[model samples]
Target chain A: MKSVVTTVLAAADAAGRFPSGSDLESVQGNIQRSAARLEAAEKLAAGHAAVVKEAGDVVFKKYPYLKTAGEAGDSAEKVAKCYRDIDHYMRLINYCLVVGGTGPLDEWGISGAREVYRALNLPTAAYVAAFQYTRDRACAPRDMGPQALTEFRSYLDYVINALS
Target chain B: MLDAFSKAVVSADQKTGYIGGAELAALKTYIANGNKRLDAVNAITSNASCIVSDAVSGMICENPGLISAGGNCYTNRRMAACLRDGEIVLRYVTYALLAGDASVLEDRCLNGLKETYMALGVPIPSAIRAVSIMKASAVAFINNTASKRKIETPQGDCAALASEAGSYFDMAASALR
Candidate 1:
């Protein structure tokens, strides 16, 4: 996981451009690297629940905007609930990862593990794609004015540095 | 127009699935059951432009959030605009119904159709009404700032208020289910 993060950080450093199309590819690669690190961390530390929690935290913190965007709207009460649900699921996965104890031998146990892993995989992909989409939209020089371009770049920097 | 409004609300309900708490369930039920009656009202109002305007004005006032009160004021504005247009169609429907002309009701209904679009900073569309409601309710959960005397609207001039609201929405949404 550390190596993966290092590689991604190095790639981003090499890219050296701000708010350009290249930055999208750079961020996408970073996300992919982060995802790969998480997968490796999950597998390597199978019994170490702390590793799982740490990895999940890495993923969640990397994209805090997921929660923000999830709740953005008018009469957004319901959308806010969905965000909470997702957060709960993520936390549950982290708990299970940290606790490292198998549940009772039943459908519930198998289902629980399956659900957590499925959610982690799916959400990671969805967020990665969403980040890429947002980046693309933000970087389209033709669409954004100079001030917006600066704001977008600053936002991108904030997101990127957050992962570091 | 009434029919279209009913369908839009129902379609949103369907997309989100049926797992919300009491408030959402009640809202859904109201739309489902009252749509027909609202359609009848539309029929009568379509002919009388003045009556339709009054009815719409009343509806808008009754549902203040239907217009410009939320983090995504643009979305609220759009919905309000649609409702406003729907009201006009309803007035036309009332007139036509009074004259026993049913043909134009279709046009009125079509004209009242609602549209969904994304605005900058708007949240992603979700399938849960509880999430949406929580987002709205959590505004009250925010701590009052010393500089600001009152709780600001989500899209008001205060960036700090908007940011705080956004954070609250994030926390609430993440904790919800």
Candidate 2:
């Protein structure tokens, strides 16, 4: 099924007419933000490693218990998994940026991951902090306006809230 | 798997084994009342916090053990997680309502929610009741909002729209079941 925006456009097409004023404005709004959205995605792609490292540093510092033995992120393999989870998180936001919506981020990125996080007894608060740190660093130093940052947060918040 | 349009198409075709006038009329009605789609969605989203809050509190009241020691949602963090999950489900229901489709709610919110709850040792029946409570409040809000906005969308009866909105909530609840 299509997103609401896509369905609006499709509804117009199915009826053989132009989109309504409100529908057109929404579609146009998304189109207007595409450049900034794509650029943010590009930035994340370019400096993903540093972004992950920065998030890891802050999250570990804040939640030292996660690094203790018998915890979720204690082992080398588990830490790697957390880093890879961060990578997956970043990649999913990239998809959200490309699509100009959080649908993909929610459906593809965080759906199954929620079960995995629960099964592993991952710290929800710590993961949420890590996601926030990633969002802060991943969206850093860009002239992409507050709207861009809001959009990025909207995407990341889906995963954060889910894990919470 | 049938979306709004395709569902209409199939129902119309079932009569004569082919699409014809029936499909066109159905499509026209669906298209013409598109405004109410958002109206229904707004009804939920505009009162999302209240709906989730009421539902969660109601569920907790019914199952006090959930807040006691050794139960899921026993601590502040777990309680917050429960509330957050409620909001997430409510958000997805609005998404499905706005689009006249349940695929998004099913694929995104409902998918793995059961497993997640199971892993967390949360009771599925309580979760189901929470969804149902939200559904009742949501449908009430949708109906009341539609009645209040009669001047704006005075096409006719909104029973069909109300039922469709209710189905999205049912879809979410059934998925966890």
Candidate 2: clashing pairs of residues: none
**Per-prediction tally of clashes:** 37, 0
Q: Of the native A-B interface contacts, what share survives in model 2? A: 0.00
lDDT of 2 by residue, B46-148 (tens): 6778889999999999999999988787999988999988887877676566556676668756888888878978899998999899988888777775333
lDDT, model 2, position B103: 68
Q: For each candidate, give the interface RMSD after superposing the true interface residues on Cα.
A: 20.0, 15.9
- How would you encode candidate 2's per-residue C-alpha lDDT over A1-164 as one tens digit per residue? 23336556456435633334566456445546655665565555566678777777777789878888889878888888887777666766655665556655566566687677678898678778888776665433453566667767777777778777
Which ranges in model 2 have alpha carbons more than 4 Å from their true place? A1-4, A7-164, B1-3, B6-22, B145-156
lDDT of 2 at B133: 91
- Docking model 1 quality class: incorrect
DockQ of each: 0.01, 0.01
Best-matching candidate per DockQ: 2
> What local distance difference test score does each model get?
0.36, 0.68
Which candidate tops TM-score? 2
